[PDB]
Symmetry: C3
Amino acid sequence: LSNLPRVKHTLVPPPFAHAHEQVAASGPVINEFEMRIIEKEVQLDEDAYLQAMTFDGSIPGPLMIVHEGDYVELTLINPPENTMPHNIDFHAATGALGGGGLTLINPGEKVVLRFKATRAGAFVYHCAPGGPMIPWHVVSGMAGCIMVLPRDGLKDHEGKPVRYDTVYYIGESDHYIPKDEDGTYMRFSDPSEGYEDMVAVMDTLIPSHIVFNGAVGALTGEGALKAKVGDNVLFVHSQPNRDSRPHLIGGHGDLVWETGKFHNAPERDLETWFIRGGTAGAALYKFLQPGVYAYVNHNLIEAVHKGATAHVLVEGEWDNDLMEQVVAPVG
Amino acid sequence: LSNLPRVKHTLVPPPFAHAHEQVAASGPVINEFEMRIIEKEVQLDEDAYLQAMTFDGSIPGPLMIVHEGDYVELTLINPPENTMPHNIDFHAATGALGGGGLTLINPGEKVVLRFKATRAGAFVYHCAPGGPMIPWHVVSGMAGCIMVLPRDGLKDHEGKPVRYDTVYYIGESDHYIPKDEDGTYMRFSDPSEGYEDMVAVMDTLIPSHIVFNGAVGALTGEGALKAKVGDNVLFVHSQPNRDSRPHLIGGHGDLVWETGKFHNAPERDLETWFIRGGTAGAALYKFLQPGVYAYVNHNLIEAVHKGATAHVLVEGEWDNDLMEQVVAPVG
Amino acid sequence: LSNLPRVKHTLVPPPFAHAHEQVAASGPVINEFEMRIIEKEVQLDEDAYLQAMTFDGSIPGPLMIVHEGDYVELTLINPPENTMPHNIDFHAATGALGGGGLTLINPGEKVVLRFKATRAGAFVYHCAPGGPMIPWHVVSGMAGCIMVLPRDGLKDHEGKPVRYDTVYYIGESDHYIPKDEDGTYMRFSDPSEGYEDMVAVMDTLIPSHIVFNGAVGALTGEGALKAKVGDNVLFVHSQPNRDSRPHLIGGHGDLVWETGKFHNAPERDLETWFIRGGTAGAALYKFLQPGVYAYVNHNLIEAVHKGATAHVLVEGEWDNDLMEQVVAPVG
Ligand SMILES: [Cu+2]
Ligand SMILES: [Cu+2]
Ligand SMILES: [Cu+2]
Ligand SMILES: [Cu+2]
Ligand SMILES: [Cu+2]
Ligand SMILES: [Cu+2]
Ligand SMILES: [Mg+2]
Ligand SMILES: [Mg+2]
Ligand SMILES: [Mg+2]
Ligand SMILES: [Mg+2]
Ligand SMILES: [Mg+2]
Ligand SMILES: [Mg+2]
Ligand SMILES: [Mg+2]
Ligand SMILES: [Mg+2]
Ligand SMILES: [Mg+2]
């Protein structure tokens, strides 16, 4: 490998994607990424907080993008101010529990893992220190995604090349914040303090919150996603621990790889697709009409009561052939 | 469009389908449909009632059938005796939140929406007035389905034409009826009165009832579906808010589009398939043996305790080559 | 049929598979299997027990393997020491509610059912005596799987023959053990005694335990599965009543039939796949690296808190090209 080019990448925060090329402009390279683990309390909603544990300070962790056959060398840093051990498990990798058995670092330590991205697809990465710590760290926010694109870019079900203009990485996360008998949420001084109470909620399998980008409303209102009519947007969707059923209100999935692995034929014209807990899927959609759209988990209680809603504001000209109000509300 | 034929359809109640042709006998047409919103209390089971909000007086709303490339003009009526605003969101449509942003009507108003059915598949339609009203109206019963057939009819995974004799539209709906501490259900005078208590149940994500055709037992016993040996039945299955896993006890899915979009290859020989909450899927089965069958959501607690069971009684001759009792129960 | 060969099989306990050949070495045969129903209390975990009802004394029931077009003649025995009626419903069969309407046997009776295995795939079989007994017997442990292999063996998405070295049958089962207010589990003298309390837990749809091979830890530690680098292992996964999302930590699904029916194209390179409640799926993986792997349901709360974890210990040489620790934990 001393013989292959090295590319150092600067990660950007979700839902955005760092700069990259859809068709690799070179032969296999070694992609260098660095992340700092940040433990901090985050506001999930009005009066709801989580003692979170995060990759690079965001939930989800940032999206990494590489090409099939490249190597990935991740420098993971556990700063001394943190309270516990962490590691990383890449579903894109082969061996040593996804890298988790080679990356356990205590506060004050760093580690560098190299793996070959042998399989194309969007994949979850997540913390997995061992035993009960595995689910607890993930539902505390420690998960992201790496997208391994085919070297010749995405292809559809007949082998035709397809291209996107923008990638939006929707990281959906379920959380289990303990509640007082009246339904209000509990607050703690650090992650460990709230562990036993959080387990009791985890045992019910009912999340208190299910959110995109780490908080209710993160991608609504002022944080709405933007696009223009004609844009091909690839929505890469991860859910590290619980199923989701994404749907774009007013749109469709033109090409969808719900299990997220690019050499498999994508399905077309979907209304709603399915992201298995522990995976990332991807859906491409070409916007045809301007206006407000919402992208949701279509259990509408999870979308609206729990937080799994993002908005997309689209600029452009309206096409009355696709839809038209014939008789406006009247009476 | 002033230039295309217009077809006025009379909807029939689920689980049945209005008259139609599998292969369009004409070029694009404008299909005209009308529905009246009916708010009324319905009996979900012995001692369990729902203050329902329905399209055309049924749960699910009626099935609309058209062909890809046709237009759909829906006249939606909110009668003055109703208590709240409603609208319609067609997952089959493009733009304005599926039509929801163009169809909000208060009691005493009507609206007419036209959209082009550009994509083949079975799709959910549902009420979505905005915010918390979206899940609450849907789990109150406001959802149905439109099936957009390819103009040249259904095709299998090799492009072969396939045909059905009968369509049965199974609309599965999850409901969240509030309970007293002893497990008995609460009753209310109107939808609004029971809203806060219903939200508390919705927040648990555990339905009190999961039903086909709007009630426990609707399609069992006297309401059992009928068929004959040799019949090809297309079971179109919607679930607007929560996943389901349909299975025909004693049968199979010969051809199944679980994500419900007809240009995608169907899978064959399934035992159980999966309907994502917020979608409609379809399964074709040719009956080979007479007798009693049941069609269920195969979480058997949801099928039996919650209500997701229908029966099918099939007439015809038994084939001992497919199955035979060799030694009858004895001892 | 008096004219076809008969093969008597000796079933082996899950997760193993009885001896068989991938490509049938003969024309259609009549496969003879026998199972004894055993009602007994089983230890699901430290301080958690289930009054179980089992096929052949195991949970899941044993795997049967035959080829498409063969017949299956199952001798089912309900010994006189048992307390209730039981039967069997094969999702692989056509008619009479999968055989359930021809196999209801009381304690002290036997029955022999013949059916033709007309469709290739892994399929669930389970007890289904009628009404509320259907879910209760299944979540009490009465379910297994039959795998009907194509006569010419498994084929991939291009029709290429694929072969496995070992089949591991992972039977995942959800259970609903009643709890005291403090979270501890209740114990009963027999199945019937605990029925009403179990129903109350079933109604919540939240399993107390979700396990492989009938108990928490059954296939971890001393019961870890074994393999060598280079082995192609087919993981056949059943879940008779509730969804699962299998994932091999450190591995992938090379070829996966998640809906479990072999003539459908398998998907490749999956990280996590999905088993619908009421079905069996299959995933083939070639081990590339030695070490510890875990095979889990990837809702990590279900995997770790509820019991859905197995371990696989793999012997062989490590490949630093696939993964290497560049900088070991240091600081
Ligand atoms: Cu961690
Ligand atoms: Cu994982
Ligand atoms: Cu409404
Ligand atoms: Cu919708
Ligand atoms: Cu039984
Ligand atoms: Cu079944
Ligand atoms: Mg940085
Ligand atoms: Mg409080
Ligand atoms: Mg397109
Ligand atoms: Mg009418
Ligand atoms: Mg009462
Ligand atoms: Mg056929
Ligand atoms: Mg024996
Ligand atoms: Mg106790
Ligand atoms: Mg391979």
